[PDB]
Amino acid sequence: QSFRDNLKVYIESPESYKNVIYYDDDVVLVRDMFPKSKMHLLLMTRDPHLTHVHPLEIMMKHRSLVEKLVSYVQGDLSGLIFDEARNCLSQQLTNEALCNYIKVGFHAGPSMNNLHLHIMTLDHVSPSLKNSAHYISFTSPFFVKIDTPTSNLPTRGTLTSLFQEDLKCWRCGETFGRHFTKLKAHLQEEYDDWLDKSV
Amino acid sequence: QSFRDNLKVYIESPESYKNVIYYDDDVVLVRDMFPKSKMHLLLMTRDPHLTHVHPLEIMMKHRSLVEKLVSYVQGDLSGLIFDEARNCLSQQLTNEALCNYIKVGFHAGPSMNNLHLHIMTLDHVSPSLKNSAHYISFTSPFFVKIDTPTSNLPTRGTLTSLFQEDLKCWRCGETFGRHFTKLKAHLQEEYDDWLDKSV
DNA sequence: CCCTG
DNA sequence: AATCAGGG
DNA sequence: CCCTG
DNA sequence: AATCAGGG
Ligand SMILES: Nc1ncnc2c1ncn2[C@@H]1O[C@H](COP(=O)(O)O)[C@@H](O)[C@H]1O
Ligand SMILES: Nc1ncnc2c1ncn2[C@@H]1O[C@H](COP(=O)(O)O)[C@@H](O)[C@H]1O
Numbered sequence: 001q002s003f004r005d006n007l008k009v010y011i012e013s014p015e016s017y018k019n020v021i022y023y024d025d026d027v028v029l030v031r032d033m034f035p036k037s038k039m040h041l042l043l044m045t046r047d048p049h050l051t052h053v054h055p056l057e058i059m060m061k062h063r064s065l066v067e068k069l070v071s072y073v074q075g076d077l078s079g080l081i082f083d084e085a086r087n088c089l090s091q092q093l094t095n096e097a098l099c100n101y102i103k104v105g106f107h108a109g110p111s112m113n114n115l116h117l118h119i120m121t122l123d124h125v126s127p128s129l130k131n132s133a134h135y136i137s138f139t140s141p142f143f144v145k146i147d148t149p150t151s152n153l154p155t156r157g158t159l160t161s162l163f164q165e166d167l168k169c170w171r172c173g174e175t176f177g178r179h180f181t182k183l184k185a186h187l188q189e190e191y192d193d194w195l196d197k198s199v
Numbered sequence: 200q201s202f203r204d205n206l207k208v209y210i211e212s213p214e215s216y217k218n219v220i221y222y223d224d225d226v227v228l229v230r231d232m233f234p235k236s237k238m239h240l241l242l243m244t245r246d247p248h249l250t251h252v253h254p255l256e257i258m259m260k261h262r263s264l265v266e267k268l269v270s271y272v273q274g275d276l277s278g279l280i281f282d283e284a285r286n287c288l289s290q291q292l293t294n295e296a297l298c299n300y301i302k303v304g305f306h307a308g309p310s311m312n313n314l315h316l317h318i319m320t321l322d323h324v325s326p327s328l329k330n331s332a333h334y335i336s337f338t339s340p341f342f343v344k345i346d347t348p349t350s351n352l353p354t355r356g357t358l359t360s361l362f363q364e365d366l367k368c369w370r371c372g373e374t375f376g377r378h379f380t381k382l383k384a385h386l387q388e389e390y391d392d393w394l395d396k397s398v
Numbered sequence: 399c400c401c402t403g
Numbered sequence: 404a405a406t407c408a409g410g411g
Numbered sequence: 412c413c414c415t416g
Numbered sequence: 417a418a419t420c421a422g423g424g
């Protein structure tokens with residue numbers, strides 16, 4: 001009905017989309033249409049019950065889905081993911097370098113209704129990263145890493161006013177107040193530095 | 200030294216500026232470079248002491264200057280002013296129509312340092328009127344009309360937070376919140392209505 | 399979610 | 404250039 | 412004051 | 417599109 005159901009077509013009809021880089025009966029790996037890092041993918045369950053379950057509920061009470069998703073990411077999709085990353089970053093990056101530069105998690109408050117796990121590089125260098133909320137949502141407790149212990153899931157209390165905070169580089173700790181454009185330029189430098197040291 | 204002395208050249212060297220439409224030893228009438236109404240003029244004293252006196256002090260303690268300025272506006276400059284107005288609005292407007300559509304006053308807090316009296320039409324239809332503070336500064340107590348009794352001069356207390364208020368049409372009382380662009384379009388309509396009824 | 403004003 | 408309402 | 416970002 | 421910091 002609304003924009004919030006936009007991801008639905010990927011799990012209904014993955015055979016129709018070239019940016020669906022993997023599908024089977026259970027899951028779909030699709031490119032993020034508005035990548036917030038050089039590589040940004042979404043792993044979606046095709047299970048019609050679970051797809052509408054809130055990610056925090058998934059983390060709390062659906063561990064078997066959580067384990068399955070992790071199995072895909074470390075297993076049958078790992079080669080695929082490393083290749084996407086090498087194409088998006090550099091061919092000269094090894095699996096080990098890439099593995100330490102990739103994060104996997106749910107947003108604590110999704111906008112899209114179909115459950116989707118973000119798998120993305122750490123750089124946050126991207127034209128689609130256009131505002132502070134974008135950046136903060138992937139670099140704060142709002143981003144719930146897939147290996148978060150259940151007792152440490154973020155709470156309504158801990159998330160309060162999170163998008164209003166000063167901008168901080170995830171890599172070196174430097175602060176930028178609310179100067180989003182300054183952060184952007186800094187992220188670019190951080191990426192060039194990391195790339196040059198990693199190739 | 201700064202932009203705040205920009206009006207100075209008009210009283211030093213009125214002979215150098217075609218937009219100085221009147222000068223003598225005592226005063227200068229010059230077009231406002233950024234008119235906030237269809238007609239917007241500035242009347243400046245050439246007296247080197249008084250030019251730097253704050254307008255509220257002028258109103259309180261320099262009545263003879265106040266009376267002289269008013270004498271110019273109603274006397275030797277009246278024909279000149281009506282012609283400027285007819286050229287800026289419409290040739291079909293009589294002195295009487297124009298007289299009731301013109302206001303004369305000081306800003307309570309000037310940005311320019313050389314004392315200048317605003318003489319302008321009421322329309323506030325102008326490309327140079329670009330923000331709410333512009334509009335409010337000419338349509339609130341911040342605009343100190345030249346015939347304000349001294350006991351009713353605005354105070355620091357009365358001016359507080361004035362530029363943060365909702366926008367109100369000076370002619371019909373309609374409110375626009377902070378929708379400046381909506382006010383603009385409305386002012387245009389108000390002007391067409393007034394013009395059509397006045398010609 | 400995004401875009402536009 | 405950062406912040407925000409409206410609409411899809 | 413204005414303009415630009 | 418409204419609000420604001422910086423600079424001239
Ligand atoms: N039509 C689309 N196709 C693919 N990805 C999308 C589409 N629309 C939005 N997205 C992404 O979906 C993600 C939703 O994240 P969330 O904030 O967790 O709901 C964001 O990263 C968006 O860039
Ligand atoms: N260089 C200039 N020449 C003529 N008028 C100007 C110039 N710069 C600014 N102004 C006007 O000077 C006025 C100053 O008003 P105030 O806010 O009372 O200081 C405003 O109406 C400006 O548009």
Ligand SMILES: [Zn+2]
Pocket residue numbers: 169170171172173174186190
């Ligand atoms: Zn950094």
Ligand SMILES: [Zn+2]
Pocket residue numbers: 368369370371372373385389
């Ligand atoms: Zn009105």
